[PDB]
Structure 1
Amino acid sequence: REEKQLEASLDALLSQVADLKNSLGSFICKLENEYGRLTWPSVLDSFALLSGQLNTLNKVLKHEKTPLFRNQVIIPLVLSPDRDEDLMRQTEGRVPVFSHEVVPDHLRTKPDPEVEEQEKQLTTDAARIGADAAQKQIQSLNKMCSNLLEKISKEERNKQTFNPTDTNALVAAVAFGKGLS
């Protein structure tokens, strides 16, 4: 029951890996082989699609129809000094040698060093007024976005120079004597 509920999310989460590899491996060879003929819209479209579809798919497989983000247990159990061929079978040759420290390195839950200063900023902007004025600002801005989508939803919804009848009247008027008396 629950294990299949984990599986139906994680299988597609690792299916997103295939699309990400198909993007990046092609990018690696096409950057080296085709550095010239610079086309900024061509790479901007690739960046736009990578931002669009991958970031939506991993989010929709990690934020809904998924096990809770604080529930499961990430457990490393086997590690050896020599190369464990199971990982190179799974990762298709990636993460080589299978060192002792690379298994703690795999669970790199520590963020970037600049994350410490942005957390310091998150403790710094709370020194001034917070969740009292900005709360009503984002409430009024949510109502403003409702007004904008209402505006969008209310905004989302030859001469006959030739005359065949007159031409057929002209071709018949001079044919015989009608319309002269």
Structure 2
Amino acid sequence: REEKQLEASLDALLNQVADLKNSLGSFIYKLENEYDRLTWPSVLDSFALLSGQLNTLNKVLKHEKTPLFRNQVIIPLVLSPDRDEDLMRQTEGRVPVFSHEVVPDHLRTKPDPEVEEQEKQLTTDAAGADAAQKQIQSLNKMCSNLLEKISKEERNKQTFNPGDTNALVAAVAFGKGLS
């Protein structure tokens, strides 16, 4: 029921993300041969189009109609580093053939994150949470009021009178009105 629809939406989002990544890679490869006249606006637009479409799809499939995360448990199919010729075309991006001495520095999905621990240590060094929340709420309310006001506020003199022109044209020749 809902699980099948969620799986289909996840598969469609993954396919769209792969297509967008291929397009971004082709654009970046086209930005290497034509390295001259590389304006910042085009690169910025490409980065925005490559991040937004993927980030929106990722956030929509994670905070919209999702069941409780205490029943579902994470469990993979199998962990086999076997080189198969009929299984390398089913991962679409990585893990084609697993190595032997790759467990230590490849298994944490190639962890890029390095600033999380630094931010946590910096926040721990400041160890009052009532005025800040109130100010944040007030700022949010003010921004909402401003946006509502903007949305509420958001939502040819003629000089060729045909009648007078026709009247003048008639007076030019016909005596009716002229004399």
TM-score by length of 1: 0.70
Taking CA–CA contacts closer than 8 Å with sequence separation of 6 or more, which of the two structures ends up with the larger relative contact order? 1
Gaps of 5+ in 1: none
Going from structure 1 to structure 2, the CA distance change for 1:159 and 1:50 (only over 3 Å counts) comes to closer
- Structure 1 position 150, deviation (Å): 2.1
CA offset at residue 112 of structure 1? 4.8
2:81/2:99 contact within 8 Å kept: yes
Contact 1:83 1:97 in 2 (8 A): yes
Tell whether the 8 Å contact from 2:82 to 2:98 is kept in structure 1 after alignment.
yes
> How much has 1:145 moved relative to structure 2?
1.3
User: What CA deviation, in whole Å up to 9, does each residue of 1:74-103 have, x standing for no partner?
Assistant: 334534444233541113574343224557
Aligned pair count reads: 179
Mark the CA change 1:146 to 1:85 in structure 2 (over 3 Å): closer, same or farther: same
Residues 74 and 109 (structure 1 numbering): CA distance in 2 closer, same or farther, change over 3 Å? farther
Aligned-partner Cα distance in 2 for 1:154–1:137: 25
Superposed CA offset, 1:17-71 (max 9, x none): 3233323331353233332331221121111112322111111112213454555
1:80–1:99 CA contact under 8 A, matched in 2: no
Aligned to 1:102: 102
**In the TM superposition, what is the alpha-carbon distance from 1:124 to its structure 2 partner?**
2.5
SS at match of 1:62: coil
Give the share of equivalent positions with the same residue, in percent.
98
Partner Cα distance (1:179, 1:96) in 2: 95
Cα RMSD over matched residues? 3.8
Higher mean alpha-carbon deviation, 117-126 vs 29-38, is at 117-126
Deviation at 1:7, TM superposition (A): 1.7
Q: 1:103 to 1:84 in 2, by over 3 A?
A: farther
| Structure 2 unmatched runs, 5+ | none
Larger radius of gyration: 1
- Output the CA distance in 1 between the equivalents of 2:158 and 2:82: 89
- Counterpart position of 1:144: 142
Distance 1:99 1:71, change over 3 A: farther
Cα gap change, 1:105/1:87 in structure 2, threshold over 3 Å: closer, same or farther? farther
Compared CA separation, residues 67 and 134, structure 1 to 2 (3 A): same
Of Structure 1 and Structure 2, the greater helix share is in: 1
